[PDB]
Amino acid sequence: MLISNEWLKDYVDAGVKVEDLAERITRTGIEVDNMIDYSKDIKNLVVGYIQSKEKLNICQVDIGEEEPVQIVCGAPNVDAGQHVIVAKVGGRLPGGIKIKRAKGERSEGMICSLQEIGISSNVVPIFVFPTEVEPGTDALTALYLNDQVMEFDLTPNRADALSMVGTAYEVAALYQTEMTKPETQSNETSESATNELSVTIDNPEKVPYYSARVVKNVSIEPSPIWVQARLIKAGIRPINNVVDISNYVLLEYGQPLHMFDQDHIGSKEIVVRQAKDEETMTTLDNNERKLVDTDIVISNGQEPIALAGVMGGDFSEVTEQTTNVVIEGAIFDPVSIRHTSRRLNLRSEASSRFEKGIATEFVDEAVDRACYLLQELASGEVLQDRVSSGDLGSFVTPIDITAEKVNKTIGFNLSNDEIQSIFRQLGFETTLKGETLTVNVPSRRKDITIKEDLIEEVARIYGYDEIPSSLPVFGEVTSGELTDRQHKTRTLKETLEGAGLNQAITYSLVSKDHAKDFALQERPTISLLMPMSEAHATLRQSLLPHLIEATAYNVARKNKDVRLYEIGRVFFGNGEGELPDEVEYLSGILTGEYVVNAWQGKKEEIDFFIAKGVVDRVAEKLNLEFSYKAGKIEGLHPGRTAIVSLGGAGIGFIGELHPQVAADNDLKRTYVFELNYDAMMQVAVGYINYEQIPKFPGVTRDIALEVNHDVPSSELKQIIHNNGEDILQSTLVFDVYEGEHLEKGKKSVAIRLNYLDTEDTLTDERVSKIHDKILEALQAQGATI
Amino acid sequence: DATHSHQFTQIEGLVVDKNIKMSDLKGTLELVAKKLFGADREIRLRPSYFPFTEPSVEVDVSCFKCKGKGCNVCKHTGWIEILGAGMVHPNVLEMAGF
Amino acid sequence: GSKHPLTRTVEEIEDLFLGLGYEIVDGYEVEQDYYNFEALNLPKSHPAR
Amino acid sequence: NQQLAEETIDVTLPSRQISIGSKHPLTRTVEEIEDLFLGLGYEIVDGYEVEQDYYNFEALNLPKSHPARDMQDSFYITDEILMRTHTSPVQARTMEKRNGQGPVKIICPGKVYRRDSDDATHSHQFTQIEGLVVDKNIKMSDLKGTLELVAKKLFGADREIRLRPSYFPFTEPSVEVDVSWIEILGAGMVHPNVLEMAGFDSNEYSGFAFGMGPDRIAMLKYGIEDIRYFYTNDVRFLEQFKAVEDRGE
Ligand SMILES: O=C(Nc1cccc(S(=O)(=O)N2CCN(c3ccccn3)CC2)c1)Nc1nccs1
Ligand SMILES: [Zn+2]
């Protein structure tokens, strides 16, 4: 919302520089996020008067000095008798540019266009003064552009400030001086618009107010320069005295007004009702519009003659050959207006105002402003009365509040008389009754409805600098602690990090064809309705796609050693209109060297087993046990992928990337793991189980088992445990041999068997007894010693 | 772009009890600015509006770079915006069951 | 390996609040209009919905 | 084609372990208790292990005459200086520096020394956590509340505890807490001579204090059979303490 300094002092004078006024406004609630200086770059610019004009054109401008100056000018429409805008020798301008005695003939100073002086696009309507202004007069002064405009970024609760008068009430408060509203009283013809005009709402649920006055006999034309500049300042190209007088009083009161030509309305009756099924009409757009149940129209008595709120009709509007006018001032349900405008891409500065809600206080007065104006500036003549439908109601809503309550919310220490002064300087009538103030809030502040709102007004004005500083004292005493899950997650992240893995943080949203990568179940994916970006369109069902990308990215930057982990959520769809299942995952990815010290010949490449070693360090730290079984996961190496299980359930996988995926991403051998961290965190582990150190030594036997090349070592270890009765403690593969010294398709797996009795020392013979049983079980399952 | 990501991180707080005041907010926001920017940090509370809170403010920390009179971090302002805060709005309390 | 700088800041704020008696709470990232907006005093109307 | 078949691994083969060290079980119990008290607003304070008899005894309401100051039971170095016998002197010194102004709410962990022969339940150097709250209306119910939180943190919330009147020089009234029955915490309302000596006004300020012994807590919690295991550092001992713990199932 753009607010001209010059213009505002019609209603209030802050007796202060526009910077000072922006500052104080910003420091009390409404942010002035910029200040436009229309006088932008401007030095020595005066009215002048072309006395005579030769032949671009040699002009003799009286610029209010003892002698005329001679100015050469080849601008399109220029002659003598014109009062013009002259930037003298030694002056300055926008665009660039600064102007001196030039010569050819002899040229002293510069006569001006508008734009030249610095207007804009889409908002402009050499420059000639419609009025005979004194040569030598400061020119911007005369042009009402000796001015700076404040641009506000206003919030929904400050609609009041969408107006010059509402903003004037605000500023009158801030400087606790006075504001004045502008002339509304016209001189009225004997007759009344009651005799002219009929108004009914068939849809009063959606239209609280509609009303109309009539002003007869009007002189379409241009508006004075003030009306004109102001409109340009306020962002709107000044069109003609009657398009202006509407848009201007919009800016002034925030009450939108419609202008109908009486004689081209098409009756002496107006009807506000809903549009119907598919209902046809063509709007002063000349673009034809078929409607819906849920649009408000205006009609004459069987003619959709205006899309209420949004637009007008073709035919009933004001053309320049109009000479009588009905002026609308209505209230249209904020959301009906919102959805029409919205859909037909038809946002006006006047629908936008119906969106925010209207000052009830102001409807009739705003109407009366545009009628007086039409009087004053379209020589128009003003009928008595209005034809209003539907009741506006009270213009004061009273709210009680107490000082205690105010001090109790903020924690300062204000008296009733301090508090009372604030409301009275906001222009609210207040009455004290014991300890309670009754605050008559005007309809012009529709964002003040409750005592808390009134608290905010006091807070903001008296100032937040003032609020002392305290800390809340909680009478339910409770020790703040990480939960168990939270604490485990921090410790786990310390463990990963301690093993060299950097914490990644990736985007949740991937591309739609990536969203199911590495997923376990077929589960539906969640896509956005309107992605900003094809690459961020659907919620990932896996952490890996973006971790792989981050690895590719790093590697292309010649960061060859990448170790990253992430704990992060993935998303599976719960059919339609339910929240998805959000599941927390731990994942990571690894490539390059794990250990390097070149000068000592140390170079340990990351392989599957070091990736395994990371997933095991996780399990170890959390006091879990995982198991591992070959799995086939699309996108992983078929030969180097394991499924990780906890309590016999699959919780994840670890695998080298498929050679084709790695090649696509220009990576070397790269390892990822993904684990359902929710599954992991559901396991209650309790306290650590302490067992005293065994009193007696154990016995180790090694065995070398020839077995078909595809038997997993887990299988042999299980057979051994199955037969190990009470003393078999653990088993360790320490060598696998496949080569020429052994039947092709066989491997030899060497396993160290560790035996232990916590209650006794082991006789060779007790060990041999079980060891022999284990050998036989193995031998019978195809495992030759 | 350099200053906008479509996915970012936030930390909110909510404290609701019987005599909570805006001075209690202030004291807490102050511990926050100290925690983040140093024991000598002051804060500044500027009027503002959010729909869920009322009164509302935006909160600056004093600049931890330049000690006073301005630098490029605080944009020769001395104050850096870092928080928004406010007293929760009744409608929010009442809708929650309070 | 490193802790992500965003996690570091989040942890120090949690620590501060823990020592004051607070709880750290997590919930859904995909959410319903009711909780995201309505429950937070943005009626179906509003410019942020 | 054969590439993938020739690069088949046995994914069940030993992983390349990246080993984790353990936090000492005494340290674990300490940290846990600190974290509990942090979230209530306390400060963890650390002080001297070798102390003046003023701070270790006198300031604690054990005058020259006391059986506690017996050279046979404590590790003196001169007649005035000794290995501290508890972390109370740090609490007494912290109090004095406060200069009559509360609140004090401090927790003081550390090694303490007792002139005794070591056996399965006695180490001449062991650990202790003491706490001190001093504030204007501290009452014994406030003590009771804090003690139940401690027990709840150590042994879980359903663990049954027992409060028994008792007696210490530096507190009155005083209390012992058993856990289901085994003694773990000693505590009391700080004796006014103790407030008065470290410069508080016992008409304005009351206090409560407590001690417990992580060596003992840990032995009890895990069934560690010999306290000296804590100070022997056999890796077969320490490695049993790598993993996280929860409340449980
Ligand atoms: O008051 C305490 N703490 C305190 C209170 C009661 C019990 C214990 S305890 O169980 O750990 N204890 C250790 C000492 N033992 C002693 C020591 C000497 C005499 C008698 N008994 C008993 C058991 C500690 N310390 C203070 N510091 C500063 C001001 S008050
Ligand atoms: Zn700075």
The number of helical runs of chain B is 2
Name the quaternary structure.
part of a larger assembly
If strands are numbered along the chain, what order do they take across the biggest sheet of chain B?
1-2-3
Question: Which CATH-level-2 architecture of the largest domain in chain A?
Answer: 2-Layer Sandwich
Subunit structure (chain D): Tetramer of two alpha and two beta subunits.
Enzyme class (chain D): ligase
EC number (chain D): 6.1.1.20
Cofactor (chain D): Mg(2+)
Descriptive report:
Chain B: Mg(2+) binds at residue 54. Chain B: It is found in: Cytoplasm. Chain B: This is Phenylalanine--tRNA ligase alpha subunit. This is part of a larger assembly, with one copy of chain A (785 residues) and three copies of chain B. Chain A is 25% helix and 28% strand. Chain A is an alpha+beta fold and 785 residues long. Chain A has six domains: 1-38 and 147-177, Phenylalanyl-tRNA Synthetase, Chain B, domain 1; 39-146, Nucleic acid-binding proteins (OB fold (Dihydrolipoamide Acetyltransferase, E2P)); 189-390, Phenylalanyl-tRNA Synthetase, Chain B, domain 3 (3-Layer(bba) Sandwich), CATH 3.50.40; 394-468, Phenylalanyl-tRNA Synthetase, Chain B, domain 1 (2-Layer Sandwich), CATH 3.30.56.10; 481-684, BirA Bifunctional Protein, domain 2; 698-785, Alpha-Beta Plaits (2-Layer Sandwich). Chain A has a seven-stranded mixed β-sheet with strand order 25-29-30-36-35-34-33, sandwiched between helices. Chain A has a five-stranded antiparallel β-sheet with strand order 5-4-3-6-9. In chain A, strands 11-21-13-20-14 form a five-stranded mixed β-sheet. The longest helix of chain A is centred in the last third of the chain and has 17 residues, at 764-780. Chains in contact: A-B, A-C, A-D, B-C, C-D. The interface between A and D is large, with 56 and 43 residues. The site of the ligand O=C(Nc1cccc(S(=O)(=O)N2CCN(c3ccccn3)CC2)c1)Nc1nccs1 has 19 residues of chain D, from helix 4, strand 5, strand 8 and strand 9. The site of zinc ion (ZN) has 7 residues of chain B, from loops.
